[PDB]
């Protein structure tokens, strides 16, 4: 019986959970008011704030950091790497602290898990970071020599639901082709070919369908034009992409539940934009379907939006079920994802990954095969 | 027997053709050297230049502008309108001259056809302008309130090949669902549902797969970032999208035959980027397939690239044939597209369109969906 | 936004959770060692013990029993009734305390939710009790005129997983036939 502690730092919240084998004995979501968060310039600044909360989450239970078998957190903005469970090593903390690949609350996770580790001598892991990238070369070409398609999605949930689908039918994730669509604040649609996410959109740099709070993709000429004219805000504009916009722009609300109400009442404009979001999600599922040449076992709809089964799910299903049967896995429990992944490592069912070596083995393929 | 004259003004060339019923009796493509074109500020300045060539084209045959049943040209940068054959009216000529919606050699076409018309009293038409729009409102939402998905594709060829596919099988274009992909300098993939292009990408404003000379679509953050840092060229950058992108940017060669040549020899890098272009074209076909909910009769590959049947076509077909059988209609005979469309009008087989009214009924059904007006 | 508190008393454990709309903000499972439980003759004697833990839970979060929109617990060994969400009324709390239909840690649930209710003026509910009955008449005959087959199972989880199975396949629970087996301390 291994006792696992999960650390899930968020932009506005911080979720923690304690597992004993497969059962969750405790979990809590601490939300941080913008008035409270407004006191740190950068994010490595909140480190001491988040960790302090993690600490107390454990005391008020009767346990001690020394009564755990391992600490697991979400993968931060590390450098491109495959999927799996990695051991938090120096390089991966050197990378997260520097913020070389961007800053986000997610980066704090591994750091906090590391300290507790270096205080109890207990392993610290990270599961399927947001930067997992295991796609084929062909998918990297963007159409412009300078730009390159980056693999930034919900690797954690994606890999998890995908494996649960295979599990649910007595098979192996490696011997199946799936098109998984994580629909939440961010939307990611990936084509899994034999256990490898050979292609997916960039759920951050504004690429793909528009989410409830993101604009997704937009014509180039319309941007490069209104980029020099008007708000020359080098920074603010960067915020108008991932955030200011999406379904929250057309309707004002970022709440699907709410939109569905307006739709129910009779809000015609709401039904339009919402129906358009499902429309786009479907188009991308079909996009990934082409990547797999039709060789698709199932189309999996997961994520928070997967819950809205009155309009969204039905609308999408009616447009893509011709590719393959549609399965629905609502929500996304990152806590259970982390705990179970780690538990599998502690049982020898899976082998840990060495970030240092793994990150290099990768960066060599992007810096050798892609030359010219 | 109606004698028709087609006018097809291009960026660097100008094609003309004379038809007698369904038979083409003459056609010629006059190319204009950049050293020759370099003498006109605006593009409307070439008007006299092009028209002069058109007239002589007619004179050289012995015929006279008065021995024609109608003059037809390609549709310019008019205002959003449905598909069909329109009569070149004042409004349409007022719009093209002003260049309100942009400047391009294509705009000269209708103007030239109009003059010959007002000189002989013969009808002047335009077929499926590049700005034709038959999309469904759902397809208009882009994800950002300010921006809107515009319908800018190869309406001419698209509508033509689509109708030839239906024709080829004793069926009606209106009773078929097709996914047509025009692959040329510009690429446009559209979903035809019962004779209506309910959706398609913007083949100009950088949207869709990358063409042999265009970058297509690129991540927003990656652009807005490298937009302020580096080449602050407000103009040059605008060219790095609709002109200096794609294969010409990776392999420095706009020509397809050329690429396949390198691929054959062993150029691995060429095979990569090229194979990636087919990859993207396939993904968009699947994209449009979802729009039609799988209800797809055929997937039609047309356009210039449709000729490359060694790699491109095979690669694409192998990835999309699960949606529906793939038909291949190489090239894009535009002179035939124009001539036959007009011929059908002169036979009463089809009814002309009034741009003035049509362009307005469009603006009506447009501003209508703007719940912010 | 309604803040809900769930009470799930078990034979050896006690699970509590706090929800804000559809999102779970906290949950904890307190296990009771047999050496600790071995201090109460009847299950009803644990009432004060469980309730004490429940308060502690909420208290140690800043919130207060008065910052909730409702208290919900699992249905105890009540008398045969349909499915649905019931309001914990006197009759129910008279039935559960008496243990007329048997004693089970589950019976404490509604009682605890009731008190918090009568202390804050907030509604106290119970969902699909362990005694929910939807059986067909034929299934009631036991083979002896006096005895009758009673429907006492894990209605809560059963109905939930069943609906998730239907949901998972874009279907309706009402248009499916399933054989569900809940395997835990008790098996149904």
Q: Which residues of A touch C28 (CB under 8 A)?
A: 25-27, 61
Q: Which residues of B touch A272 (CB under 8 A)?
A: 137-138, 141, 369, 371
A311 Cβ contact list (under 8 Å, min separation 6): A260, A263, A271, A274, A275, A278
Nearest CA in chain C to A31: C25
Q: Identify whether the C-beta of residue B66 lies closer than 8 Å to the C-beta of residue B47.
A: no
Quick one: tokens of A216?
Answer: 């997704």
Give the distance from CA B221 to its chain's centroid.
30
Resolution of the determined structure in angstroms stands at 3.0
- CATH code at C1-135: 3.30.420.40
User: Which is the CATH superfamily of the domain at A1-135+333-372?
Assistant: ATPase, nucleotide binding domain (3.30.420.40)
Dihedral of CA atoms B214, B215, B217, B219 in degrees, nearest 10, equals -160
Partners of C3 in the β-ladder: C20
Nearest-angstrom CA–CA distance, B308 and B319: 16
Nearest-angstrom CA–CA distance, B158 and B164: 10
Contact A207 B220 (CB under 8 A): yes
| Contact call for C and B: 3+ CB–CB distances under 8 Å | no
Q: Which residues of C touch A8 (CB under 8 A)?
A: none
Nearest-angstrom CA–CA distance, A157 and A181: 10
The chains in contact with chain A, meaning 3 or more Cβ pairs closer than 8 Å, are B, C
Nearest-angstrom CA–CA distance, B71 and A1: 86
Identify which of B209, B234, B293 has the shortest CB distance to residue A322: B293
Q: How far is CA B295 from CA A62, A291, B192, C2, C87, in A?
A: 61, 19, 10, 45, 51
Of the candidates B191, B238, B248, which has an alpha carbon nearest to the alpha carbon of residue B214? Answer: B248
Of the candidates C41, A185, A160, A74, which has an alpha carbon nearest to the alpha carbon of residue C49? Answer: C41
Nearest CA in chain A to C28: A26
Contact B143 A280 (CB under 8 A): yes
Contact C22 A326 (CB under 8 A): no
Q: How far is CA A195 from CA A130, A167, A325, B126, in A?
A: 17, 13, 19, 53
Q: Identify whether the C-beta of residue B216 lies closer than 8 Å to the C-beta of residue B242.
A: no
Quick one: tokens of B261?
Answer: 């040549």
Residue C29 touches partner A, C-beta closer than 8 Å: yes
Q: How many beta-carbon pairs under 8 angstroms link A with B? A: 216
Q: Please say whether the dihedral angle defined by the alpha carbons of residues C32, C38, C39 and C43, taken in this order, is positive or negative.
A: positive
Q: Which residues of A touch B288 (CB under 8 A)?
A: 283, 286
Of the candidates A163, A188, A179, which has an alpha carbon nearest to the alpha carbon of residue A300? Answer: A179
The single-letter DSSP state of residue A252 is S
Q: Identify whether the C-beta of residue A27 lies closer than 8 Å to the C-beta of residue A333.
A: no
Q: Identify whether the C-beta of residue B151 lies closer than 8 Å to the C-beta of residue B135.
A: yes
Strand order in the sheet with A326-330: A197-200, A187-193, A177-183, A298-303, A326-330
b/e A308-326 (16+ beta carbons within 10 angstroms → b): beebbbebbbebbebbbeb
Question: To probe the interface with A, which of B77, B144, B281, B367 has the most A CB atoms within 10 Å?
Answer: B144
Identify which of A61, A257, A329 has the shortest CB distance to residue C168: A329
Q: Can you name the CATH fold of B136-332?
A: Nucleotidyltransferase; domain 5 (3.30.420)
Of the candidates C35, C126, C116, which has an alpha carbon nearest to the alpha carbon of residue C79? Answer: C126
Q: Identify whether the C-beta of residue C103 lies closer than 8 Å to the C-beta of residue C128.
A: no
Q: Identify whether the C-beta of residue A209 lies closer than 8 Å to the C-beta of residue A216.
A: yes
The rounded radius of gyration (Å) of the Cα atoms in chain B is 21
3-state secondary structure of B183: strand
DSSP string, A145-209: SS-B----S-HHHHHHHHHHHHHTTT--GGG-EEEEEEESSSEEEEEEESS-EEEE--TTTT-SS
Technique employed here was X-ray
Contact B223 A223 (CB under 8 A): yes
φ/ψ region of C62 (left if φ > 0, alpha if ψ in -120 to 50, else beta) reads: left
Looking from the CA of B252 toward its CB, the CA atoms found within 13 Å total: 1
Of the candidates B67, B53, B74, which has an alpha carbon nearest to the alpha carbon of residue B18? Answer: B67
Of the candidates A73, A86, A74, which has an alpha carbon nearest to the alpha carbon of residue A359? Answer: A86
Q: Which CATH architecture has domain B1-135+333-373?
A: 2-Layer Sandwich (3.30)
Nearest-angstrom CA–CA distance, C108 and A316: 45
Across B264-313, where does the E strand assignment appear?
A: 298-303
Q: Identify whether the C-beta of residue A291 lies closer than 8 Å to the C-beta of residue A198.
A: yes
A52 Cβ contact list (under 8 Å, min separation 6): none
| Contact call for A and C: 3+ CB–CB distances under 8 Å | yes
Strand order in the sheet with A3-9: A85-87, A124-127, A70-74, A3-9, A13-20, A23-31, C23-31, C13-20, C3-9, C70-74, C124-127, C85-87
Angle made by CA atoms B91, B96, B102, in degrees to the nearest 5? 135
The chains in contact with chain C, meaning 3 or more Cβ pairs closer than 8 Å, are A
Dihedral of CA atoms C82, C85, C88, C91 in degrees, nearest 10, equals -10
Roughly what angle, to the nearest 10 degrees, separates helices A334-346 and A155-167? Answer: 70
Nearest-angstrom CA–CA distance, B362 and B342: 23
Q: How far is C170 from chain A (nearest CA, A)?
A: 7
Element (H, E) at C28: strand C23-31
Q: Which residues of A touch B297 (CB under 8 A)?
A: none
Nearest-angstrom CA–CA distance, A25 and C41: 27
Identify which of C28, C60, C168 has the shortest CB distance to residue A328: C168
Identify which of C23, C27, C168 has the shortest CB distance to residue A327: C168
Nearest CA in chain A to B143: A215
A306 Cβ contact list (under 8 Å, min separation 6): A183, A313, A328, A329, A330, A331
Element (H, E) at B13: strand B13-20
Nearest-angstrom CA–CA distance, B241 and B207: 10
Quick one: tokens of A359?
Answer: 């990150």
CB atoms < 10 A from the CB of A39, how many? 9
Residue carrying structure tokens 């599998």: A344
Q: Identify whether the C-beta of residue A114 lies closer than 8 Å to the C-beta of residue A93.
A: yes
Helices (H) and strands (E) in chain B, counts: 13, 12
Nearest-angstrom CA–CA distance, B168 and B181: 18
Q: Which residues 176-235 of B are in CB contact (within 8 Å) with A?
A: 202, 204-207, 209-210, 214-228, 232, 234
Element (H, E) at A316: helix A312-320
For chain A, domain boundaries: 1-135+333-372, 136-332
Burial class (CB in 10 A: 0-12, 13-18, 19+), B190: buried
Q: Which residues of C touch A329 (CB under 8 A)?
A: 168
Contact C170 A326 (CB under 8 A): yes
Nearest-angstrom CA–CA distance, B116 and B144: 45
């Amino acid at each position: 019986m291994f006792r696992i502690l999960t650390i899930n730092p968020g932009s506005t919240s911080t979720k923690l959970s304690i597992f004993e084998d497969e059962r969750m004995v405790k979990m809590q979501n601490f939300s941080h008011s913008p008035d409270e968060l407004g006191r740190f310039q950068k994010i490595l600044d909140q480190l001491e704030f988040r960790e302090k909360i993690a600490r107390q989450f454990v005391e008020e239970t009767g346990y001690s950091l020394s009564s755990f078998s391992a600490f697991v957190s979400r993968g931060g903005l590390l450098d491109p790497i495959p999927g799996g469970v990695y051991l938090v090593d120096g390089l991966m903390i050197k990378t997260l602290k520097s913020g070389k690949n961007g800053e986000h609350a997610s980066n704090l996770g591994a750091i906090i898990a590391h300290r507790f580790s270096s205080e109890t001598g207990v392993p610290a892991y990270v599961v399927d970071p947001v930067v997992v990238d295991e796609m084929e070369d062909v998918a990297r070409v963007s159409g412009h020599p300078n730009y390159q398609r980056k693999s930034i999605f919900h690797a954690l949930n994606q890999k998890t639901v995908a494996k649960e689908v295979a599990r649910m039918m007595n098979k192996r994730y490696e011997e199946m082709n799936l098109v998984v669509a994580h629909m939440g604040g961010g939307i990611s649609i990936a084509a899994h070919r034999k256990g490898r996410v050979i292609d997916v959109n960039n759920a951050l740099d504004g690429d793909g369908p528009f989410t409830p709070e993101r604009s997704g993709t937009l014509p180039l000429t319309q941007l490069v034009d209104l980029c020099f004219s008007g708000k020359f805000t080098y920074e603010e504009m960067k915020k108008r992409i991932v955030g200011n916009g999406g379904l929250v722009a057309y309707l004002g609300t970022s709440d699907a539940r709410e939109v569905v109400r307006r739709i129910k009442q009779g809000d015609e404009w709401a039904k339009r934009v919402y129906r358009a979001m499902a429309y786009q999600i479907a188009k991308w599922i079909g996009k990934m379907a082409a990547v797999l040449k039709g060789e698709v076992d199932f189309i999996v709809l997961t994520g928070g939006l997967a819950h809205e089964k009155e309009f969204l799910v039905p609308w999408i299903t009616k447009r893509v079920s011709f590719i393959a049967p549609v399965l629905v896995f609502p929500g996304s429990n990152e806590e259970k994802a982390l705990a179970l992944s780690a538990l599998r490592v502690l049982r020898g069912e899976e082998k840990p990954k060495n970030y240092s070596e793994e990150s290099r083995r990768w960066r060599e393929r992007y810096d050798s095969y892609l030359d010219g």
